[PDB]
Design a protein around this ligand. Structure first.
Ligand SMILES: CO[C@H]1O[C@H](CO)[C@H](O)[C@H](O[C@@H]2O[C@H](CO)[C@H](O)[C@H](O)[C@H]2O)[C@H]1NC(C)=O
Ligand SMILES: [Ca+2]
Ligand SMILES: [Ca+2]
Ligand SMILES: [Ca+2]
Ligand SMILES: [Mn+2]
Length: 1106
C-alpha cells in the first residue's frame, strides 16, 4: 500500500468557540455540535477535524438548520431544525456540549417531532415517527497518524473462547480501511488516551456486529490518517404494526468522552488508561455492586406440581451453605417459583407458586435470608407461554408469515411463542408491576430465560434495554441466559457462569478490554474450562463456575457444590472486590482442541486496586502452554503471596452482604486442591497474634486448632479439596433456627443432633445418617421394640386445616408411621416395605445412584396425614415411629402446611369413608398416585393441569380433549404414548387396598387415542422379569363423545397388603389423525387426563358378582 492522501481542511468559513474546564479545553464549531480538538496538560487529541454538517434522520440525510448559544464557560447549546418534506421529517432537536473536568458530554436534551405522535396509540404512517437519529460522520474523539504512539483499541462481542473480540490497531499511513461497530473503543497517543461511551442501542447485525454503540472510522485528511470514534445511531419513537410504543421506551441520546494521562502509574499512555477513566463515564448495570459478594450462586428447582423445593425449605439450604462457607454471600435462583413450577404458567409473573407455600412463604424466605447475605432471584419468561396462563390469548401469540402458530416447547403442555414487540406495545410493564405489588421489597434478581434467541421475535440490544429497564424500575437486577445477551444491563449470564453449557463457541465475553473494564460488575466472563482452550485455559481472573444441588438438571451433589465454590469462586469473587488497573499479555501459544489448531495470546499478568490503594497482582506461572505452570498463578496482596498454584490462603474482610468486617471478625480462607504442606507469610497485623484454624463442614467451624507462628509464618498441611478458615481469636457456631416458619425444628436433619426430639424407646436405634448423596436422614433400624420421635408442631393457626408429610423410604416390613395428635384428635398413616422407586428428577431423593438412599436405590415417597387444629394449638404433636424390625427405615423432610382437601368421606382429616380426589386441593404431586418409571428419573411429563377456558379445553386450535375435566384442575399426562411402562401408581401409604377387601375404583378420563393408555392393577414392586398386571386398555374419549368418559373397576386387596392401581403407557402406536409436529402435540392425540377419582370399599352383592 502507498502513502495515502485526502483533502486538506479549509476552515475559512468556520467560526469556532471554546468551552473548557480547569483541565480540558474543547474547540467547538458554532455551526454544528462538533469538537475540532481537545487540549489537556499541553497535549492534544483531535476530534472531528473535517466539518460534516449533516445528520441522518430515519436513514435520510438532513442538513440541519442550526442556531448556537454558549451557555457558560463549560457549556454550549445548539438548536437543530430538521426538515425533509419528501420523507415527512419535520422536527427539531437541541444538543448540548459540556466539559466536566476531563470529560466531554454530548447530550440531545430535547426532541420535538412536529408530526402528531401519541405513545400507546395507532399511527397511520410509521414514516411520520422520528425513529432514528445518527451523527455518524462526526467523531467525538480521534487520533492522527502524525502523532507519536497513535493507536486504536476496540472490543466487539465474541463468545468463542478461541477468538478474542478485541482489535488493537496502530494508526499509520498507510493503514487498512476501518468502518466498524464496537462496544468499547479507545484512541491514544503517547501522551493522552480517550474512551467513548454512548447509550446508543444500535446494532449492525448479530455476533461481533451487535451491541455496537460506537463506530470507528478511518478518515484520511491531507497526509494523515485519523481513526475517530463516533456514537452509533440512536433510537427514539418506534412502533409495532402501527401501535406506537410506550413513552418509557424513549431515552434521550447521550454520549461522553473521557481524556486522561497515565492512570495506572506505568509511565505509558495506552488504552488501559482510557479504560480506567472510562469507568467514570460508563453506564453501570443496575445492581452491579452486589455481584462481588454473591459467591454461592445455585438454582433451586420446582416442577410439575411436585413442590420439590418449598420456599421455606430453601432457607435451610441457605443455612447449610452459610455454615459451610463461614458466611459467604449467596444467590439462589428459584426456577419454578411460580405456578406449578418450572415452565408452567409463564408470563403471569405475579402467580407465585401456591404448592411451594405461596407469596407468604416467599416473603418469609426473602426476609430471613437477608442475615445470611443470601439473595433470591426468580426465573421468568417473556417469550413463550401455555394455554393455562392467564396471559395466554390469541392476540399475544406469535404467528409465522403463513399464519401458523410459532410453536414453542412441548413438555408438560405445548407452549406457543409470543410476539415480544406486540407484548411491549400492549401492557407488558404492568405484569412486572403486579408481581412487585404482590411480592413487595427485597427480591434481588430477575433471570429472563430464552430472551435473545429470537423465539419471540426481536430480542436485540434496543429491545433488551427496554425489557431490562422495566425490570430495573421495580428495583430488580437483570440476569439472562446467553453469553451474548444483555451486554448493557445484565449482571449475570447463565451460559457464562455454568461452564458446562454450550461448548467453546457459546461461553462468556472473550474480550480483555471488556473484562478489564467490567470484571467487578458482572459474571459474564470466560471461566476455567480447559477443554475449550483459548481464554478458558486458566483465565488469570478465574470466572464464575456454577454448580447446583437442589434439583436443576437433576443436580444433587452438595459436597461437589461446596468444593467447586472454593476451587473457582472464592478467588473469582476476591478479585471482583478490586478494579483491574493493568493487563499484560504474553507471547502467542499454539493450542489444539475442538477440531482446530490455532494461535492464542494469553494474559500473563493482571493488576487490580481498590479505594484503599491495596494492590493485587496476579501472574501466570509460565507462558509455555504445554507446561503445568501455564495453568497456575501467583497472587500477591501488597507484595504478600496469597495464592501459589494449587493452594491459597486468602484474606476475606467482608461479611455475607459485603459489609466491612470488624477487626475481630477478619479471617482467611485456606484451600488446596492437592495434598502437601504450604507455608505462608502472615500480614503484619496477624504476625504477632495467636492464630486458630477451623475445618469447615456443613456443621460450620470444626476441629479448632491453635497454630504455631514461626518467624511471622505458618505452615499448613491439611486435607486436599477441603475448606478451612483462620481467625486471630476463638470462634463458635451460631444457632441456626433450623426450619423456622415450618412448625417443626430441623425438618431436614441438618443440625447434627436429635436432642430436640422426644424419643420413646431405645434411642440408640435412631441415628442421623448420610445418603449416597450426603443428604442427612433419620434412620431407625435393628429395634426389637417400637421407637418413636416426637416434636410439638409450633406456630399453627387455630381451627385450620393442614397437611403434613414426611419423606419415607422403608426397607423393613415393619410399620413406619407419621402420627399427629392435635390435643383433641389423633390421626396416623403408615407404610410397610416401600414398593415404588422415586422418579422425580428435581427431587433430592430420587433413585439416581449418586443420591440414592442406600444400596444404590431410593424409594422415598411423601407419607401424609391430614388434620385440623382445634381452638388450642399449644399441644399439637408430630411423631415418627417404627415398630420392631431388623432392616432400616429412612425419614427425611417433615413439611406441615395449610391444605383444604376433603378426601375422606367428604371430610378433610385422615379417616375412614369413601376416598375421593377431585384434584382441586392437592398439597403436592399427584396423590394418591406417585409418578412411575415410564421416563426413568425425569422432569416427569405428568402434572396437575390448570383450567383456562377456552384455550385448555376441547375445540380451541382443534384441541381434541380437555386439559381439565371438572373444576379447575385435573391430572394430566402429556405425550407419553408407546412407552410400555408405568406412568403412575398408588402406593399403600397413600391408599391401602386392605387384604381381602374389595373396592370400586371410578374416575373420569380423557384420552386422545385408542388403547394408548391402560388402567392397571398390580401388587408389590413393579418390574418392567416383568410384573404381572391386570390390564384395561382405554378407548379414546372424543371420536364418539363430547366429554370425558367414566371408567369403573373392582379391585380386591391382595393378602400381602401391597395392591395398587395406576395408569400404564401401552405398546400401541397413537394416532395423530394426519396431524404432525406442534399441532399433533397441542391437540392431545397422545394425552391422557384423569379427574374425579373415587375409591369406595364395597361388599359384592347382586350383579356386582357378575
Ligand atoms: C431439543 O431438546 C432440547 O431443548 C428442549 C427445549 O426446546 C428441552 O429443553 C430439552 O431438555 C429437556 O427438557 C425437559 C423439560 O422441558 C426435561 O427437563 C428434560 O430433562 C430435558 O432433557 C433439550 N434437550 C434434550 C431433549 O436433550
Ligand atoms: Ca498507563
Ligand atoms: Ca435431609
Ligand atoms: Ca377436578
Ligand atoms: Mn400445565
Amino acid at each position: 500500500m502507498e502513502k495515502e492522501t485526502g483533502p486538506e481542511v479549509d476552515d475559512s468559513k468556520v467560526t469556532y468557540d471554546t468551552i473548557q474546564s480547569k483541565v480540558l479545553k474543547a474547540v467547538i464549531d458554532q455551526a454544528f455540535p462538533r469538537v475540532k480538538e481537545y487540549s489537556l496538560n499541553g497535549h492534544t487529541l483531535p476530534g472531528q477535524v473535517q466539518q460534516f454538517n449533516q445528520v441522518f434522520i430515519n436513514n435520510h440525510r438532513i442538513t440541519p438548520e442550526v442556531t448556537y448559544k454558549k451557555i457558560n464557560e463549560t457549556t454550549a447549546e445548539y438548536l437543530m431544525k430538521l426538515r425533509d418534506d419528501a420523507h415527512l421529517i419535520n422536527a427539531e432537536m437541541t444538543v448540548r456540549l459540556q466539559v466536566v473536568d476531563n470529560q466531554l458530554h454530548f447530550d440531545v436534551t430535547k426532541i420535538v417531532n412536529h408530526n402528531q405522535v401519541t405513545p400507546g396509540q395507532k399511527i397511520d404512517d410509521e414514516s411520520k415517527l422520528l425513529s432514528s437519529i445518527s451523527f455518524l460522520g462526526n467523531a467525538l474523539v480521534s487520533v492522527s497518524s502524525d502523532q507519536t504512539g497513535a493507536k486504536f483499541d476496540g472490543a466487539t462481542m465474541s463468545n468463542n473462547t478461541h477468538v478474542s473480540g478485541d482489535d488493537h490497531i496502530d494508526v499509520t499511513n498507510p493503514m487498512k480501511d476501518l468502518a466498524k461497530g464496537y462496544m468499547y473503543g479507545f484512541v491514544s497517543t503517547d501522551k493522552l488516551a480517550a474512551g467513548v461511551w454512548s447509550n446508543s442501542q444500535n446494532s449492525y447485525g448479530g455476533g461481533s456486529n451487535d451491541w455496537t454503540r460506537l463506530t470507528a472510522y478511518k478518515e484520511t485528511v491531507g497526509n494523515a490518517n485519523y481513526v475517530g470514534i463516533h456514537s452509533s445511531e440512536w433510537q427514539w419513537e418506534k412502533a409495532y404494526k402501527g401501535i406506537v410504543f410506550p413513552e418509557y421506551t424513549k431515552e434521550l441520546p447521550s454520549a461522553k468522552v473521557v481524556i486522561t494521562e497515565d492512570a495506572n502509574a506505568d509511565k505509558n499512555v495506552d488504552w488501559q488508561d482510557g479504560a480506567i477513566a472510562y469507568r467514570s463515564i460508563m453506564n453501570n448495570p443496575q445492581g452491579w455492586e452486589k455481584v462481588k459478594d454473591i459467591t454461592a450462586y445455585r438454582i433451586a428447582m420446582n416442577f410439575g406440581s411436585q413442590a420439590q423445593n418449598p420456599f421455606l425449605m430453601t432457607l435451610d439450604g441457605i443455612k447449610k451453605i452459610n455454615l459451610h462457607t463461614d458466611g459467604l454471600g449467596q444467590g439462589v435462583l428459584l426456577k419454578g417459583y411460580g405456578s406449578e413450577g418450572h415452565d408452567s404458567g409463564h408470563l403471569n409473573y405475579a402467580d407465585i407458586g401456591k404448592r411451594i407455600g405461596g407469596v407468604e412463604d416467599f416473603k418469609t424466605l426473602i426476609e430471613k435470608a437477608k442475615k445470611y447475605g443470601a439473595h433470591l432471584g426468580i426465573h421468568v419468561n417473556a417469550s413463550e407461554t401455555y394455554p393455562e396462563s392467564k396471559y395466554f390469548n390469541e392476540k399475544i401469540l406469535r404467528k409465522n408469515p403463513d399464519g401458523s402458530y410459532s410453536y414453542g416447547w412441548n413438555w408438560l403442555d405445548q407452549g406457543i411463542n409470543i410476539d415480544a414487540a406486540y407484548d411491549l406495545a400492549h401492557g407488558r410493564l404492568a405484569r412486572w408491576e403486579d408481581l412487585k405489588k404482590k411480592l413487595g421489597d427485597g427480591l434481588d434478581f430477575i433471570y429472563v430465560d430464552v430472551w435473545g434467541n429470537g423465539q419471540s421475535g426481536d430480542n436485540g440490544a434496543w429491545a433488551t434495554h427496554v425489557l431490562a429497564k422495566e425490570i430495573n424500575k421495580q428495583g430488580w437486577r437483570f440476569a439472562i441466559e446467553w453469553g451474548h445477551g444483555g451486554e448493557y444491563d445484565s449482571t449475570f449470564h447463565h451460559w457464562a457462569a455454568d461452564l458446562t453449557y454450550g461448548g467453546y463457541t457459546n461461553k462468556g465475553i472473550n474480550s480483555a478490554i471488556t473484562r478489564f473494564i467490567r470484571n467487578h460488575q458482572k459474571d459474564a466472563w470466560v471461566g476455567d474450562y480447559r477443554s475449550y482452550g483459548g481464554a478458558a485455559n486458566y483465565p488469570l481472573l478465574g470466572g464464575y463456575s456454577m454448580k447446583d444441588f437442589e434439583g436443576w438438571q437433576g443436580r444433587s451433589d452438595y459436597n461437589g457444590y461446596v468444593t467447586n465454590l472454593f476451587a473457582h469462586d472464592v478467588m473469582t469473587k476476591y478479585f471482583q472486590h478490586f478494579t483491574v488497573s493493568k493487563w499484560e499479555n504474553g507471547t502467542p501459544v499454539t493450542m489444539t482442541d475442538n477440531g482446530s489448531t490455532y494461535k492464542w495470546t494469553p494474559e500473563m499478568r493482571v493488576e487490580l486496586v481498590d479505594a484503599d490503594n491495596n494492590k493485587v497482582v496476579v501472574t501466570r506461572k509460565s507462558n509455555d502452554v504445554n507446561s503445568p505452570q501455564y495453568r497456575e498463578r501467583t497472587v500477591t496482596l501488597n507484595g504478600r503471596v496469597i495464592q501459589d498454584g494449587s493452594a491459597y490462603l486468602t484474606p476475606w474482610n467482608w461479611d455475607a452482604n459485603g459489609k466491612k468486617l470488624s477487626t475481630d471478625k477478619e479471617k482467611m480462607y485456606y484451600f488446596n486442591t492437592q495434598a502437601g504442606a504450604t507455608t505462608w507469610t502472615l500480614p503484619s497485623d496477624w504476625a504477632k497474634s495467636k492464630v486458630y484454624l477451623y475445618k469447615l463442614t456443613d456443621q460450620g467451624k470444626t476441629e479448632e486448632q491453635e497454630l504455631t507462628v514461626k518467624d511471622g509464618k505458618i505452615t499448613l498441611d491439611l486435607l486436599a479439596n477441603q475448606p478451612y478458615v483462620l481467625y486471630r481469636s476463638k470462634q463458635t457456631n451460631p444457632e441456626m433456627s433450623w426450619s423456622e416458619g415450618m412448625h417443626i425444628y430441623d425438618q431436614g436433619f441438618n443440625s447434627g443432633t436429635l436432642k430436640h426430639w422426644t424419643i420413646s424407646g431405645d434411642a440408640s436405634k435412631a441415628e442421623i445418617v448420610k445418603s449416597q448423596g450426603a443428604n442427612d436422614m433419620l434412620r431407625i433400624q435393628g429395634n426389637k421394640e417400637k421407637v418413636s420421635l416426637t416434636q410439638k408442631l409450633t406456630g399453627l393457626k387455630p381451627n385450620t386445616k393442614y397437611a403434613v408429610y414426611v419423606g419415607v423410604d422403608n426397607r423393613s416390613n415393619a410399620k413406619a408411621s407419621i402420627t399427629v395428635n392435635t390435643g383433641e384428635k389423633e390421626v396416623t398413616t403408615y407404610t410397610n416395605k416401600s414398593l415404588a422407586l422415586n422418579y422425580v428428577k428435581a427431587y433430592a431423593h430420587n433413585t439416581r445412584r449418586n443420591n440414592a438412599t442406600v444400596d444404590d436405590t431410593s424409594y422415598f415417597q411423601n407419607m401424609y396425614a391430614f388434620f385440623t387444629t382445634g381452638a388450642d394449638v399449644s399441644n399439637v404433636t408430630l411423631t415418627l415411629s417404627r415398630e420392631a424390625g431388623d432392616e432400616a427405615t429412612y425419614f427425611d423432610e417433615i413439611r406441615t402446611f395449610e391444605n383444604n382437601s376433603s378426601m375422606y368421606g367428604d371430610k378433610h382429616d385422615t379417616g375412614k369413608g369413601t376416598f375421593k380426589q377431585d384434584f382441586e386441593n392437592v398439597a403436592q404431586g399427584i396423590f394418591p398416585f406417585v409418578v412411575g418409571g415410564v421416563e426413568g428419573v425425569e422432569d416427569n411429563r405428568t402434572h396437575l393441569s390448570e383450567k383456562h377456558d377456552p384455550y385448555t379445553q376441547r375445540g380451541w386450535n382443534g384441541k381434541k380433549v380437555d386439559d381439565v375435566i371438572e373444576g379447575n384442575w385435573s391430572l394430566k399426562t402429556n405425550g407419553l404414548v408407546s412407552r410400555r411402562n408405568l406412568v403412575y401408581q398408588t402406593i399403600p401409604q397413600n391408599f391401602r387396598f386392605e387384604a381381602g377387601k374389595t373396592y370400586r375404583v371410578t374416575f373420569e378420563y380423557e384420552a386422545g387415542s385408542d388403547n394408548t393408555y391402560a388402567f392397571v392393577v398390580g401388587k408389590g414392586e413393579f418390574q418392567s422379569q416383568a410384573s404381572n398386571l391386570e390390564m384395561h386398555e382405554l378407548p379414546n374419549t372424543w371420536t364418539d363423545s363430547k366429554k370425558a368418559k367414566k371408567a369403573t373397576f373392582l379391585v380386591t386387596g391382595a393378602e400381602t397388603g401391597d395392591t395398587w392401581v395406576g395408569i400404564y403407557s401401552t405398546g400401541n402406536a397413537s394416532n395423530t389423525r394426519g396431524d404432525s409436529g406442534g399441532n399433533a402435540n397441542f391437540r392431545g392425540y397422545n394425552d391422557f387426563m384423569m379427574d374425579n377419582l373415587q375409591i369406595e370399599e364395597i361388599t359384592l352383592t347382586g350383579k356386582m358378582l357378575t
